[PDB]
Amino acid sequence: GVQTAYWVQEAVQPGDSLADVLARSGMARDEIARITEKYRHLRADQSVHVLVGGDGGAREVQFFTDEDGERNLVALEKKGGIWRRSASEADMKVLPTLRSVVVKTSARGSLARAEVPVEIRESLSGIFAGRFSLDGLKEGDAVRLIYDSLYFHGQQVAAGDILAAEVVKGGTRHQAFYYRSDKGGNYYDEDGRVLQGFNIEPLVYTRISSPFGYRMHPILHTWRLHTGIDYAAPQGTPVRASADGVITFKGRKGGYGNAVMIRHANGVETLYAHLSAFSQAQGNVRGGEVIGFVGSTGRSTGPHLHYEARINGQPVNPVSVALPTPELTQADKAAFAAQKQKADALLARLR
Ligand code: NI
């Protein structure tokens, strides 16, 4: 009898194009065209979804883009015969995720079995990197986490930042709390003291135009993930290394324009882009010496620096990880205490 609509999932293979994946799914030739007419692009490690109507006609197509610098969540619907970027306020919903796990084999291993996003395992590693090694957790060691999770139409699509984390290694308790204020946040321990190389910011900037993490466009309601920090600064402004390490690259790089990377050791790297010019200071960099100057090369509006920290792999909120953490004043102390208590109430849920 009558046919019902169904979803088709097509994974994205190496250096694949949208039209490519869309074609392997079985989508019509002329249909692929009407789509790519308005929409180095397709984020690998995923799969584009296509809703097929009972009549075999495509009605929707959602997927993630991995453009250089940021990733976009593209949702497209077909109405009246035209593909339009679908979006709405109620589409996404962020919830606090309470995950508790006890180490058995390895720390990173057990956390993976507990359904803990790779992003979080690495973000957690850098946060406590100044107290212990996340890989030195023996059996019986606990890891209690609380982090925002993004749900698209009731379906978990990503993971926000860590709100609080309690780790017990060998019986020693280590706590980390996320604190935000003013008109990104930072991580502090239970006593409000700084946790933990990166003793300075990459430069002197006028203001931070765009923070790290997921954010919804105020009017388009679309969602995008900025894989770094946008430091607004006059072009030509000296861009120095945040810490020691060794520069491993430099030159034009996709939408990043001129950029350089530094392997700060311990399995961590950094990247500064959109530079107007370098300064050629390869080899080992003491940490602090100029390595570039602000510009607007690659995919960028005006002058500013793109700071991106990549722990054991890909993008990770550089805050309190690959940047210095400011001390808490009275303009905080009280507020922080109020926030620490809220997170601890959720933590106690995993004890
Ligand atoms: Ni950026």
Numbering used by the authors: 57 to 95, 102 to 245, 250 to 262, 266 to 420
What does the paper say about this structure?
NMB0315 is an OMP identified in Neisseria meningitidis as belonging to serogroup B. The development of a universal vaccine against this group remains a challenge. Proteins in this family are characterized by a conserved active site containing an HXH motif, and all are zinc-dependent. Our results suggest that NMB0315 is a zinc-dependent peptidase and belongs to the M23 metallopeptidase family.
Two molecules of NMB0315 were present in one asymmetric unit. The overall structure consists of three spatially separated domains: Domain I (residues 58–151), Domain II (residues 152–265 and 397–420) and Domain III (residues 266–396). This metal ion is coordinated by three spatially adjacent residues (His295, Asp299, and His375) and two water molecules (W142 and W141). One possibility is that the Zn2+ was replaced by another metal ion such as Ni2+ during the expression and purification of the protein. Based on these interactions, Domain I of NMB0315 is capable of tightly associating with Domain III, which blocks the active site and the substrate binding groove, suggesting that full-length NMB0315 is in an auto-inhibited conformational state. Based on the comparison of NMB0315 and other M23 metallopeptidases in their active form, we propose that the maturation of NMB0315 requires the amino-terminal domain to be removed.
